[PDB]
Amino acid sequence: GSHEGEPVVGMDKSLFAGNTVIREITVQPNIGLLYDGMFSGCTALEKLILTGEDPSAYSAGDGLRDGADFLICVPEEALDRYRRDYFWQTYAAWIQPMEQ
């Protein structure tokens, strides 16, 4: 099943749908395709943060949040960019700006 405790994005993408209790997921640009089934059964996942400034530096196919439901924080200087994008428009119902 699992033998693990670190649902984290480091040179793989499978290790998230297991820790039921990760309310926040920071992610970086260009670090794998956010395929289907990443997040299945996240009984407490309610945030995502993107440490990149452009939408093409992320890829998510169609499957991005299968088995989940959360908002997508991006930096303000990327907000308009993501809203003009030829994918991430379809997630503009969940994108929002960051804060401190």
Furthest C-alpha separation in the chain: 41
CB 88 within 8 A of CB 79: no
Domains of the chain: total: 1
Q: Which helix (H) or strand (E) holds 76?
A: helix 76-83
What experiment produced this structure? NMR
C-alpha span between 54 and 15 (Å, rounded)? 24
Q: Is the dihedral of CA 18, 70, 21, 99 positive or negative?
A: positive
Supply angle C-alpha 24, 20, 17, rounded to 5: 85
Q: For tokens 């996942």, what's the residue?
A: 45
Looking at the DSSP bridge assignments, the partners of residue 93 are none
54: helix, coil or strand? coil
Q: Which domain holds residue 65?
A: 1-100
Q: In the chain, what are the helix, strand and coil shares in percent, each to the nearest 5?
A: 15, 10, 75
58: helix, coil or strand? coil
CATH code assigned at 71 = 3.40.50.12480
